[PDB]
Design an enzyme around this catalytic site. Structure first.
Site, PDB file in Angstrom:
ATOM      1  N   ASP A  96      19.326  12.676   2.375  1.00  0.00           N
ATOM      2  CA  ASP A  96      18.306  13.708   2.442  1.00  0.00           C
ATOM      3  C   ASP A  96      18.343  14.701   1.284  1.00  0.00           C
ATOM      4  OD1 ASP A  96      16.035  14.794   4.402  1.00  0.00           O
ATOM      5  OD2 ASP A  96      17.337  16.551   3.986  1.00  0.00           O
ATOM      6  N   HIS A  99       0.823  -1.201   0.000  1.00  0.00           N
ATOM      7  CA  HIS A  99       0.000   0.000   0.000  1.00  0.00           C
ATOM      8  C   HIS A  99       0.861   1.257   0.000  1.00  0.00           C
ATOM      9  CE1 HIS A  99      -3.445   2.549   0.728  1.00  0.00           C
ATOM     10  NE2 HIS A  99      -2.909   3.000   1.849  1.00  0.00           N
TER      11      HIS A  99
HETATM   12  C1  ACO Z   1      10.362  10.163   6.205  1.00  0.00           C
HETATM   13  C2  ACO Z   1      10.097   9.101   5.174  1.00  0.00           C
HETATM   14  O1  ACO Z   1      10.571   7.981   5.289  1.00  0.00           O
HETATM   15  S1  ACO Z   1       9.047   9.439   3.888  1.00  0.00           S
HETATM   16  C3  ACO Z   1       8.948   7.984   2.862  1.00  0.00           C
HETATM   17  C4  ACO Z   1       7.867   7.011   3.344  1.00  0.00           C
HETATM   18  N1  ACO Z   1       7.883   5.674   2.715  1.00  0.00           N
HETATM   19  C5  ACO Z   1       7.426   5.460   1.462  1.00  0.00           C
HETATM   20  O2  ACO Z   1       6.943   6.330   0.777  1.00  0.00           O
HETATM   21  C6  ACO Z   1       7.537   4.066   0.883  1.00  0.00           C
HETATM   22  C7  ACO Z   1       6.192   3.479   0.461  1.00  0.00           C
HETATM   23  N2  ACO Z   1       5.109   3.587   1.381  1.00  0.00           N
HETATM   24  C8  ACO Z   1       4.864   2.677   2.302  1.00  0.00           C
HETATM   25  O3  ACO Z   1       5.598   1.721   2.554  1.00  0.00           O
HETATM   26  C9  ACO Z   1       3.588   2.888   3.053  1.00  0.00           C
HETATM   27  O4  ACO Z   1       2.691   3.597   2.160  1.00  0.00           O
HETATM   28  C10 ACO Z   1       3.719   3.646   4.388  1.00  0.00           C
HETATM   29  C11 ACO Z   1       4.749   2.974   5.314  1.00  0.00           C
HETATM   30  C12 ACO Z   1       4.086   5.094   4.130  1.00  0.00           C
HETATM   31  C13 ACO Z   1       2.357   3.564   5.128  1.00  0.00           C
HETATM   32  O5  ACO Z   1       1.933   2.177   5.098  1.00  0.00           O
HETATM   33  P1  ACO Z   1       0.406   1.704   5.312  1.00  0.00           P
HETATM   34  O6  ACO Z   1       0.388   0.218   5.491  1.00  0.00           O
HETATM   35  O7  ACO Z   1      -0.420   2.491   4.335  1.00  0.00           O
HETATM   36  O8  ACO Z   1       0.210   2.338   6.765  1.00  0.00           O
HETATM   37  P2  ACO Z   1      -0.952   2.217   7.891  1.00  0.00           P
HETATM   38  O9  ACO Z   1      -1.051   0.823   8.396  1.00  0.00           O
HETATM   39  O10 ACO Z   1      -0.706   3.301   8.915  1.00  0.00           O
HETATM   40  O11 ACO Z   1      -2.294   2.601   7.132  1.00  0.00           O
HETATM   41  C14 ACO Z   1      -2.463   3.946   6.603  1.00  0.00           C
HETATM   42  C15 ACO Z   1      -3.855   4.080   5.998  1.00  0.00           C
HETATM   43  O12 ACO Z   1      -3.907   3.225   4.860  1.00  0.00           O
HETATM   44  C16 ACO Z   1      -4.923   2.229   5.024  1.00  0.00           C
HETATM   45  N3  ACO Z   1      -4.397   0.968   4.452  1.00  0.00           N
HETATM   46  C17 ACO Z   1      -3.343   0.232   4.849  1.00  0.00           C
HETATM   47  N4  ACO Z   1      -3.139  -0.843   4.044  1.00  0.00           N
HETATM   48  C18 ACO Z   1      -4.090  -0.795   3.099  1.00  0.00           C
HETATM   49  C19 ACO Z   1      -4.475  -1.628   1.928  1.00  0.00           C
HETATM   50  N5  ACO Z   1      -3.770  -2.745   1.614  1.00  0.00           N
HETATM   51  N6  ACO Z   1      -5.534  -1.205   1.192  1.00  0.00           N
HETATM   52  C20 ACO Z   1      -6.234  -0.090   1.488  1.00  0.00           C
HETATM   53  N7  ACO Z   1      -5.960   0.719   2.539  1.00  0.00           N
HETATM   54  C21 ACO Z   1      -4.913   0.402   3.361  1.00  0.00           C
HETATM   55  C22 ACO Z   1      -5.249   2.182   6.493  1.00  0.00           C
HETATM   56  O13 ACO Z   1      -6.623   1.885   6.653  1.00  0.00           O
HETATM   57  C23 ACO Z   1      -4.966   3.604   6.933  1.00  0.00           C
HETATM   58  O14 ACO Z   1      -6.133   4.413   6.737  1.00  0.00           O
HETATM   59  P3  ACO Z   1      -6.372   5.791   7.589  1.00  0.00           P
HETATM   60  O15 ACO Z   1      -5.043   6.556   7.517  1.00  0.00           O
HETATM   61  O16 ACO Z   1      -7.534   6.440   6.865  1.00  0.00           O
HETATM   62  O17 ACO Z   1      -6.722   5.283   8.958  1.00  0.00           O
END
Ligand code: ACO
Length: 376
Positions: free
Chosen positions: A260, A183
């Site tokens: 960064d 996600h």
């Molecule tokens: C400082 C930095 O590091 S910035 C760079 C950040 N990292 C990245 O961009 C790399 C790619 N991204 C990721 O790995 C992920 O998107 C992350 C780590 C940023 C977040 O991961 P997620 O599993 O989405 O996180 P989390 O469990 O907190 O869920 C976030 C939201 O997504 C939703 N969600 C999680 N998984 C799913 C899924 N498979 N399908 C639909 N919705 C989902 C949750 O319901 C939640 O909703 P809400 O915020 O409305 O309550």
């Protein structure tokens, strides 16, 4: 450190009830490093020393890694009574190979709170020097007949948190976006995801006189301000924690962190010989205008600067953290996560089996196991 003390305590409190997890908490040996912000010659206090430590975390469920988080803690020393710490949140990532529902947001927050609980004196007890003395022996002396530094500071010191939000397909898990269960937040969602984590950190862990700052480089402040209105911490402002007159020159104000987009742009300015030409104002504009636009993605910078509610007094146990003896060993263990291919679940299996084998065989240590405590 009253209810929750261990990294086990912290993770468990946010992980789902009765579900089992394991974690890797890995740490480099603290070392002396260049100052976070370039010193100006015309300044009355330059740091005595800057100490940099990497914490690298990985969470596992059912024999598969699924989450990792890379953080750097800098303790800056000006004297015996004068010190600051800064937690730079560098990369957070997931690979989608978890078959249970967890809050990655809350896992991430709780990890930073474990980190905020660490006594800065923990990093100061044994520090690799920036300059080591050696006496080298010429092989000419063989015939056919044959140090760490330490420092102290107050426990309750000025605490900074800095992060740059920018989405990507992955940061710690190569080809994991090929997993259809991964996600990926878009830039706007990711900025809100981090702003929610920081807002809760401010409210749970910081005093009410704390600076809390958000900017979206190259964008008009009117957008930023509207968003901040929904925060529960009452003192968020548009801008950053770097502001003020070290002169307005970006180079004497911008902190320089590993991997960064900042540092990367200061380095482009260095190559162009423009470090004495670019103000903080032109900086944020050219950062977006000249560098970050190529990513075609919403990015933000967030900063916190203030005092913890509770005095940090934890010295992490061997359960809390593993500190390899060697920089090579640290790197080899981290690379079992970061050098794997995650286009299939086999990469997530292999990372787990390689890590646990390495730790058991080379260090007589296990990954820590956790039972979740949070009800739904
Ligand atoms: C400082 C930095 O590091 S910035 C760079 C950040 N990292 C990245 O961009 C790399 C790619 N991204 C990721 O790995 C992920 O998107 C992350 C780590 C940023 C977040 O991961 P997620 O599993 O989405 O996180 P989390 O469990 O907190 O869920 C976030 C939201 O997504 C939703 N969600 C999680 N998984 C799913 C899924 N498979 N399908 C639909 N919705 C989902 C949750 O319901 C939640 O909703 P809400 O915020 O409305 O309550």
């Amino acid at each position: 450190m009253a209810a929750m003390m261990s990294l086990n305590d912290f993770l468990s409190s946010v992980l789902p009830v009765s579900e089992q997890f394991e974690y890797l908490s890995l740490q480099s040996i603290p070392l002396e490093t260049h100052a976070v912000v370039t010193p100006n010659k015309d300044d009355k206090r330059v740091p005595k020393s800057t100490i940099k430590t990497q914490h690298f975390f990985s969470l596992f469920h059912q024999g598969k890694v699924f989450f990792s988080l890379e953080v750097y803690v800098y303790v800056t020393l000006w004297d015996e009574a004068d010190a600051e710490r800064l937690i730079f949140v560098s990369k957070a990532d997931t690979n989608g190979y978890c078959n249970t529902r967890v809050s990655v947001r809350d896992i991430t927050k709780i990890i930073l709170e474990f980190i905020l609980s660490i006594d800065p004196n923990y990093y100061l007890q044994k520090v690799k020097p920036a300059i080591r003395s050696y006496k080298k022996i010429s092989p000419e002396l063989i015939s056919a007949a044959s140090l760490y530094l330490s420092f102290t500071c107050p426990r309750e010191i000025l605490t900074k948190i800095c992060l740059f939000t920018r989405p990507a397909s992955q940061y710690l898990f190569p080809d994991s976006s090929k997993n259809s269960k991964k996600h990926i937040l878009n830039g706007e969602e990711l900025m809100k995801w981090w702003g929610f984590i920081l807002d809760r950190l401010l409210i749970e862990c910081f005093q009410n006189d704390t600076q809390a700052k958000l900017r979206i480089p190259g964008e008009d402040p009117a957008r930023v301000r509207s968003y901040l209105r929904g925060m529960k911490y009452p003192l968020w402002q548009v801008g950053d924690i770097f502001t003020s007159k070290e002169n307005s020159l970006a180079v004497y104000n911008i902190p320089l962190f590993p991997d960064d987009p900042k540092a990367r742009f200061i380095h482009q300015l260095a190559e162009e010989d423009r470090l004495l030409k670019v103000s903080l104002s032109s900086f944020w504009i050219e950062l977006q205008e000249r560098q970050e636009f190529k990513l075609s993605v919403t990015s933000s910078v967030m900063g916190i600067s203030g005092y913890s509610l509770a005095t940090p007094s934890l010295f992490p146990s061997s359960a809390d953290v593993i500190v390899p003896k060697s920089r090579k060993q640290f790197r080899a263990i981290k690379k079992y996560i970061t050098g794997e291919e995650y286009d299939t679940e086999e990469g997530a299996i292999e990372a787990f089996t390689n890590i646990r084998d390495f730790l058991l065989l080379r260090m007589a240590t296990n990954l820590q196991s956790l039972t979740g405590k949070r009800e739904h």
